Design a binder for this molecule. Structure first.
Ligand code: MG
Ligand code: MG
Ligand code: MG
Ligand code: MG
Ligand code: MG
Ligand code: MG
Ligand code: MG
Ligand code: MG
Ligand code: MG
Ligand code: MG
Ligand code: MG
Ligand code: MG
Ligand code: MG
Ligand code: MG
Ligand code: MG
Ligand code: MG
Ligand code: MG
Ligand code: MG
Ligand code: MG
Ligand code: MG
Ligand code: MG
Ligand code: MG
Ligand code: MG
Ligand code: MG
Ligand code: MG
Ligand code: MG
Ligand code: MG
Ligand code: MG
Ligand code: MG
Lengths: 80, 129, 151, 123
RNA sequence: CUUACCACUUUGUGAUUCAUGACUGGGGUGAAGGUAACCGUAGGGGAACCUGCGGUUGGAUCACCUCCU
RNA sequence: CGGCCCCCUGGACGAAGACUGACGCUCAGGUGCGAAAGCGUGGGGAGCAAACAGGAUUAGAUACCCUGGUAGUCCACGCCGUAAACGAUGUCGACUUGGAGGUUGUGCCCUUGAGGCGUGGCUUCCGGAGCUAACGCGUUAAGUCGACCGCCUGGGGAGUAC
RNA sequence: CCCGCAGAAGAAGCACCGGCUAACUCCGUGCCAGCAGCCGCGGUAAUACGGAGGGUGCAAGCGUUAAUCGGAAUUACUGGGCGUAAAGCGCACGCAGGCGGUUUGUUAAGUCAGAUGUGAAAUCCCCGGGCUCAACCUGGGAACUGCAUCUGAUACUGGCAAG
RNA sequence: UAGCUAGUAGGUGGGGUAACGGCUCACCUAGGCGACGAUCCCUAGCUGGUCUGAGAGGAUGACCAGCCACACUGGAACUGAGACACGGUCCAGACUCCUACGGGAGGCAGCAGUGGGGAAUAUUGCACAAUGGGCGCAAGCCUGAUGCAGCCAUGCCGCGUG
């Protein structure tokens, strides 16, 4: 219903923030070997709730910092 | 280590019928029998069978016409190294349709001619003339 | 050392003054494609066609008197804007023109300078480098070329 | 080799430099001759390779081959060179264009008159 | 009228460079004989070559004068 | 890697099970090993021997030969990290005619020695199809395939300059 | 644009002709020279240089140069190699990475199918229309291989679970 | 070119903006970013497309259309819906220009055109009849947009030279 995207958390050290590395797997333009491409997306995490290495769902919102334009809807797994 | 059954299934046929053997055996698996039957079900091999309990053995019967191997060129196209998928409109041709291409469509593994009739795209397993 | 260069100059002097032309610029260098360059200072104009008449004349005399350790690679040459001048007749005619001079036994503050000629002596030249006219002894100078003003 | 290597490092397209640098892609580049000279071929052959020394407008000083005969050029002549090279003489990658404004066109030519500016004979 | 900002500037202080240009690392350079080739290294030293050690076989040189279906 | 013996220890192979349960393969970067020569310090010191020394021998002895002979060669501990370090053939797997061998296992059975049957590992040599430019390679493939890495792009310049 | 007028009347050239490549003789010529994109050409005979005839090719142009792609499988994705021709690191271990036996279940990421949205017009291409033809202009379409979303499908890959 | 970074990565609070926001401040934290190539230097307007190629590709960004940036050089805002404004303002600079020497003026990368550069590229044209745009009720006015002409074998296509 809403555009949403899931990623693993590279880091949570940031106060009230998380660094999320999301993986997207693609046909390759010349050859055709599908290679993983990752983005160091800055994500707003309230509560400083998540933990480093967790898997988590994320949705975009109005920009909120110099680098953070996304906020987390919910977490999928836990207890990493 | 071994990293592909199908390739080893194929060459075993190729090198097998190269030595003009009668029937070549290899450990069974779903894809294999799925693959293997399509040959006979197309006429590429005489017949096949599975033997043993808790042990996988596939023994398929080759065929020769006028002292000549019935299959002549068999190439695994989608490889464990690089995977290959083709949309229905774009399913290739082998020797201008004289050859058959094995395509794993979502509904079932089948011949590309049937896949075009089914209007379905799939992973191109291999070629055979 | 002069490889009989004076003898070669005498051998090629007769043809150059034979068709009347005027001799400057004797040079030879052995090596890969060993070659010698002969310059004709034609006042009328050094056309390669005028050079052509001199070149057949000098080759015909040269074959009978082939030079020692010198190959048949003569360059009948117009003395270009940067023609090299060695005699005091040149600097004499080259009254107030600049020249770049390099010498054999290089030393700290050697006469490797480029400047305008102000006076001419048989063994010495006065040439304005360092912002002052200075004595140059062509005795140790084995290479020197007249320079046009350029960018 | 293995595509996994190509994705690490793809096929570098083999670079290829031009064989006529003093042109800078301009199909012709005028320059002023600086000294003309003929040179002698080795012992077996006697010939007058007619080539001249020319500084280009852009300071690229080079030599240019002088084709034909009857040319009245000498130092300070302001000629126009063009692409092409002669296999026999090394170091010559450019030839002038016969019939250039400074050049006097080769006289008495009744064939191939476009390659020398020899105008159609009035006849 | 004064405060902050800041162009230009100036001072030095460097770096990165771009040329000009005095000067210097280096591709080409103007016979008594004993002969498989080589590789790594050391020394002789103009250098090369030979020698020292260890290793390899890759254990030979050379070549120029016309036809239609 | 080469006397004998002891002490310390790594790896391979076979037989027969039992055991875990895909725990695997490759490897940029990365560490490590790494002939000879050389270097540092200390050794040591027979033989051998660069260099050197002498004797013999032409523009000139020089080279060639003798007779010496230092470093070195050895040890200890450092350093160097290159060799035609080559099978000029990356690693792992699977498949595909044969004959001859060597070598180390081990089953069976003759009366066992022997001998007969087997069945493993390593290794040598021919040679089939195959492949290869050819030479050749040819179940230890340079054959038929797979997975991954390294690597090549005219010769010289140059494995040089920076 | 049409009508009239007079009269063949006002209107052809460049390149090449040894090979590659269509098109050949004659005299010059004396290594003089020239010619050259290369291989090569040249002496007493030169179809390769100069000239004449003759011929080829194009054509109001014809040539030369530059320049890019092609040819070039000559960076080889399609589509190359590495015993000796250039090319397997001296050898090993090993992180990252790449890849992965077999069975069932789940997932739907890959993938596939469909749909919707978008992918400007021109350009290209098809079928036309209009300029007397053509170029040119123009109608309609196709195409724009993409992207996003929704629905799907589950063989394979992946994930998850158990083997 | 392997590290890069302190308003730097984030947080609170305030201010600030049409609006989000280190936009900016105050403080708080000490992060963030890089071999999935940061950083740096060097080169370059981008796209629809164009050229080449059987294709994949490769090369390209002249004309036309979309977007961006720039308007002597540097800096600044003002006004306005919209500008940090090509034929607007101010400051600095260079240059040119005027001068009474005290000061002033100026910006063709609009259209023509000159000089220069260069192998090389055109008219100091006509008209606002058409389409457009401005202002205006309109009439109409303005428009080097545009429509046309001139120049040039620059190209394509057509035709003639019987
Ligand atoms: Mg002559
Ligand atoms: Mg060895
Ligand atoms: Mg040693
Ligand atoms: Mg000696
Ligand atoms: Mg020592
Ligand atoms: Mg090596
Ligand atoms: Mg092999
Ligand atoms: Mg000709
Ligand atoms: Mg190619
Ligand atoms: Mg090759
Ligand atoms: Mg060799
Ligand atoms: Mg080799
Ligand atoms: Mg790994
Ligand atoms: Mg995996
Ligand atoms: Mg699997
Ligand atoms: Mg369109
Ligand atoms: Mg159209
Ligand atoms: Mg029509
Ligand atoms: Mg699965
Ligand atoms: Mg705030
Ligand atoms: Mg543009
Ligand atoms: Mg333009
Ligand atoms: Mg305002
Ligand atoms: Mg304005
Ligand atoms: Mg203006
Ligand atoms: Mg203008
Ligand atoms: Mg000019
Ligand atoms: Mg007006
Ligand atoms: Mg025309």
């Amino acid at each position: 219903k809403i555009r949403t995207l899931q990623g693993r958390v590279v880091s949570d050290k940031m106060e009230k923030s998380i660094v999320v590395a999301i993986e997207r797997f693609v046909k390759h333009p010349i050859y055709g070997k599908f290679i993983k491409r990752t983005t160091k997306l800055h994500v707003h995490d309230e509560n400083n709730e998540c933990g480093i290495g967790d898997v988590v769902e994320i949705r975009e919102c109005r920009p909120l910092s110099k680098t953070k334009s996304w906020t987390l809807v919910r977490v999928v797994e836990k207890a990493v | 280590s071994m990293q592909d059954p199908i390739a080893d299934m194929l060459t075993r046929i190729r090198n097998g019928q190269a030595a003009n053997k009668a029937a070549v055996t290899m450990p069974s698996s779903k894809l294999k029998v799925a693959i293997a039957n399509v040959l006979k079900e197309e006429g590429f091999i005489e017949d096949f069978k599975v033997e043993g309990d808790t042990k996988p053995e596939l023994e398929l019967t080759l065929k020769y016409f006028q002292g000549k191997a019935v299959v002549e060129s068999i190439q695994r196209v989608s490889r464990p190294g690089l995977r290959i998928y083709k949309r229905k409109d774009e399913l290739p041709k082998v020797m201008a349709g004289l050859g058959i291409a094995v395509v794993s469509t979502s509904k079932g593994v089948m011949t590309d001619r049937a896949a075009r009739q089914a209007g379905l795209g799939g992973e191109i397993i291999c070629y055979v003339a | 050392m002069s490889t009989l260069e004076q003898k070669l100059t005498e051998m090629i002097t007769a043809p150059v003054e034979a068709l009347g032309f005027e001799l400057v610029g004797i040079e030879f260098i052995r090596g890969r494609t060993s070659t010698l360059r002969i310059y004709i200072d034609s006042e009328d104009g050094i056309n390669v066609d005028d050079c052509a008449d001199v070149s057949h004349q000098v080759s015909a005399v040269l074959d009978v008197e082939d030079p020692i350790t010198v190959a048949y690679n003569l360059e009948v040459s117009s003395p270009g804007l940067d023609r090299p001048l060695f005699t005091a007749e040149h600097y004499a005619r080259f009254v107030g023109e600049e020249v770049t001079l390099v010498l054999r036994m290089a030393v700290q503050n050697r006469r490797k300078w480029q400047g305008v000629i102000k006076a001419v002596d048989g063994e010495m030249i006065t040439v304005t480098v360092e912002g002052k006219d200075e004595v140059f002894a062509l005795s140790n100078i084995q290479k020197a070329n007249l320079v046009p003003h350029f960018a | 080799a293995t595509v996994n290597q190509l994705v690490r490092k793809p096929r570098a397209r083999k670079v290829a430099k031009s064989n006529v640098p003093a042109l800078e892609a301009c199909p012709q580049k005028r320059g002023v001759c600086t000294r003309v000279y003929t040179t002698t071929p080795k012992k077996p052959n006697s010939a007058l390779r007619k080539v001249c020394r020319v500084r280009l407008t852009n300071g690229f000083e080079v030599t240019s081959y002088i084709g034909g005969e009857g040319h009245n050029l000498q130092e300070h002549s302001v000629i126009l060179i063009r692409g092409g090279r002669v296999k026999d003489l090394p170091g010559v990658r450019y030839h002038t264009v016969r019939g250039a404004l400074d050049c006097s066109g080769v006289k008495d030519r009744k064939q191939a008159r476009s390659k020398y500016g020899v105008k159609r004979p009035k006849a």
